[PDB]
């Protein structure tokens, strides 16, 4: 007894810390930069949609104005 | 085959196969019948949602715990909980697995006998064994001595053990536990305007207690500080909005543990029943018990309790002895980890209550040599 | 977050173990030095008794 | 961030302080123990010469 405390504690004392650091690094890398880039891409597409909407609205208002 | 280490508890049922690190399925032990009428046809509405399913439909249920203070008050509901645990959370038929239940100290005999009778007749297990909830928590710490304070959610008990020889005359069982703290918190929240009454809102108050409350190192200084500054007021968002702000209710709810006069209980706090439990022991093993005080159970997870308790005991104890409080990070599942370790032992493999033995002596076999 | 708390807990386990070992060693030093000085006093009394016997 | 750095550094400092204090205490314990052994060894011979003197 009291000799399995080493073999159940020291293991996770380093392996768990290193593995969680690895998980945090990979999750941040996968998540944050890709999300910001994708949001910028969607913003550019949204601006293009806004331009298309403005053009169509203006041309239809020009024709229909009677 | 492998053994099933179930642990009924009172508030959270923890179960899993023997030999692992953590319980496989942990879910509240509540059985809630619906209370309204119900107009949709064919919706597939059941008559009783148990376990973690009734913590999601709790808006239209009346949850009721089947275990009040360690003892079991509603046997049909407890049978339903066990059936759910075996068949849906573990999906292993009990006909092929030994079981290791756990029971608080100083409980009524009839409860234990009915438990074994159910396990042998309804579920028809091969062999079951009942163990005291504190010896397991001592197993999990890897010690062999020490006095363990297992403050669960139903009942707080304090079993001292030396060199493997338990001291039956020094067990101090006190019935203040997490549930009474939930009720007291729900009662002092009314001083700001928030009223929780329904049995469903008791769960919300429990969540508030878990996430916000903490044990003060010194009570009077905290009461004075919270009454002048506002650095303590932490806010919390209800399940529908309308955030609430908890002031000095934060450290007044768990203070009831050290002053049970708050909820009208006469007895002394958990800081003084441990010292009394030690002083009943012999004069030559008091140093070891002082040095190996073990904490377990859910309710001992309050942030800052391992320092308050040490300060209190150091105040009570003689100045020469060293007071050390073992507070492992895996406190909540300490009893179940110990249960897994005990069930995995080879020396223990012949202590099970085999079914043929029960057939020969009846349910009263549990009080006999097979304890 | 998640890993940060566990790393803090490891740093705290090291704290408790190191502090406990330091305190225990300090108590050991106190006890051992008291033993040595009491033995030295016994030696002194023996020297004085030898002196009386010589007289 | 800010909190992680200061807390981690303070805790590592606590561990190092406890360790070095324990090492100093154990060194003094070993030295005192050996000196105590010397005191015992000399005291035995002092007793022997005292016994001869008394005879
Ligand atoms: N993190 C926590 N902080 C404060 N209290 C907690 C925490 N987790 C659980 N509790 C309290 O402990 C109780 C669960 O205790 P538990 O050890 O599951 O009891 P049992 O011995 O019946 O298993 C809950 O009702 C809750 O009030
Ligand atoms: Mg328990």
From Swiss-Prot, chain B:
**EC number(s) from the headed UniProt entry:** 3.6.4.-
Which residues are annotated as modified residue Methionine (R)-sulfoxide in the UniProt record? Answer: 40, 43
> Where in this protein does the record say N6-methyllysine is found?
80
Q: Which SUPFAM superfamilies match?
A: Actin-like ATPase domain
Supply one GO BP term.
cardiac myofibril assembly
Q: Which reaction does it catalyse?
A: ATP + H2O = ADP + phosphate + H(+)
Which GO cellular component terms are attached? actin filament; cell body; filopodium; glutamatergic synapse; I band; lamellipodium; synapse
Keywords on this record? Acetylation, ATP-binding, Cytoplasm, Cytoskeleton, Hydrolase, Methylation, Muscle protein, Nucleotide-binding, Oxidation
Which PANTHER family does the entry link to?
Answer: ACTIN (PTHR11937)
Q: What is this protein called?
A: Actin, alpha cardiac muscle 1
Species of the source: Mus musculus (Mouse)
UniProtKB/Swiss-Prot annotation, chains C, D:
Could you tell me which residues carry Phosphoserine?
Answer: 45
Q: What induces it?
A: Induced in stimulated quiescent cells.
- Write out the ranges of the annotated region (Disordered): 1-38
Where it sits in the cell: the answer is: Cytoplasm, Cytoskeleton
Where on the chain is N-acetylmethionine found, per UniProt?
A: 1
Feature: compositional bias, Basic and acidic residues = 12-38
Which miscellaneous remark does the UniProt record hold? The sequences of cardiac and skeletal muscles are identical.
The UniProt function text for this chain reads: Binds to actin filaments in muscle and non-muscle cells. Plays a central role, in association with the troponin complex, in the calcium dependent regulation of vertebrate striated muscle contraction. Smooth muscle contraction is regulated by interaction with caldesmon. In non-muscle cells is implicated in stabilizing cytoskeleton actin filaments.
Q: Per the similarity annotation, which family is this?
A: Belongs to the tropomyosin family.
On assembly, the entry states: Homodimer. Heterodimer of an alpha (TPM1, TPM3 or TPM4) and a beta (TPM2) chain. Interacts with HRG (via the HRR domain); the interaction contributes to the antiangiogenic properties of the histidine/proline-rich region (HRR) of HRG. Interacts (via N-terminus) with LMOD2 (via N-terminus) and TMOD1 (via N-terminus).
The text the record gives for the protein's domains is: The molecule is in a coiled coil structure that is formed by 2 polypeptide chains. The sequence exhibits a prominent seven-residues periodicity.
Record's protein name: Tropomyosin alpha-1 chain
The gene name on file is Tpm1
**Entire-sequence positions represented here:** 1 to 55 of 284
């Amino acid at each position: 007894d009291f000799d399995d405390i080493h073999r159940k504690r020291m293991e996770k004392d380093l392996n768990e810390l290193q593995a969680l650091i690895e998980a945090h690094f990979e999750n941040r890398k996968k998540e944050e930069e890709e999300l910001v880039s994708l949001k910028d891409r969607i913003e550019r597409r949204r601006a293009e949609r806004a331009e298309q909407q403005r053009i169509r609205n203006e041309r239809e208002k020009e024709r229909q104005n009677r | 085959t492998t053994a099933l280490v179930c642990d009924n508890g009172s508030g959270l049922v923890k179960a899993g196969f023997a030999g692992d690190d953590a319980p496989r399925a942990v879910f509240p032990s509540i059985v809630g019948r619906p209370r309204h009428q119900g107009v949709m046809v064919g919706m597939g509405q059941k008559d009783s949602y148990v376990g973690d399913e009734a913590q999601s439909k709790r808006g239209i249920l009346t949850l009721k715990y089947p275990i009040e203070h360690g003892i079991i008050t509603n046997w049909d509901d407890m049978e339903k909980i066990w059936h759910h645990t075996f068949y849906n959370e573990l999906r292993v038929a009990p006909e092929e697995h030994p079981t290791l239940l756990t029971e608080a100290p100083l409980n009524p005999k009839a409860n234990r006998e009915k438990m074994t009778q159910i396990m042998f007749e309804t579920f028809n297990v091969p062999a079951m064994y009942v163990a005291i909830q504190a010896v397991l928590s001592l197993y999990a710490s890897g010690r062999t001595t020490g006095i363990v304070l297992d403050s669960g959610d139903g009942v707080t008990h304090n079993v001292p053990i030396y060199e493997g020889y338990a001291l039956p005359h020094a067990i101090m069982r006190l019935d203040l536990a997490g549930r009474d703290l939930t009720d007291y918190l729900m009662k002092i929240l009314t001083e700001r305007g928030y009223s929780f009454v329904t049995t469903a809102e008791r769960e919300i108050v429990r969540d508030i207690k878990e996430k916000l409350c903490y044990v003060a190192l010194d009570f009077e200084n905290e009461m004075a500080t919270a009454a002048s500054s506002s650095s303590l007021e932490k806010s919390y968002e209800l399940p529908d909005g309308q955030v609430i702000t908890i002031g000095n209710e934060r450290f007044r709810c768990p203070e009831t543990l050290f002053q049970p006069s708050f909820i009208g209980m006469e007895s002394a706090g958990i800081h003084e029943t441990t010292y009394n439990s030690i002083m009943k022991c012999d004069i030559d093993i008091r140093k070891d018990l002082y040095a190996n005080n073990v904490l377990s159970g859910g309710t001992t997870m309050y942030p800052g309790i391992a320092d308050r308790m040490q300060k209190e005991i150091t105040a009570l104890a003689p100045s020469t002895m060293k007071i050390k409080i073992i507070a492992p990070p895996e406190r909540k599942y300490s009893v179940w980890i110990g249960g897994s370790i005990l069930a995995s032992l080879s020396t223990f493999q012949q202590m099970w209550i085999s079914k043929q033995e029960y057939d020969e002596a009846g349910p009263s076999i549990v009080h006999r040599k097979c304890f | 977050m998640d890993a940060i708390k566990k790393k803090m807990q490891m740093l705290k386990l090291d704290k408790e173990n190191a502090l406990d070992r330091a305190e225990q060693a300090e108590a050991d030093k106190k006890a051992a030095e008291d033993r040595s000085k009491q033995l030295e006093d016994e030696l002194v009394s023996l020297q004085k008794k030898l002196k009386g016997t010589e007289d």
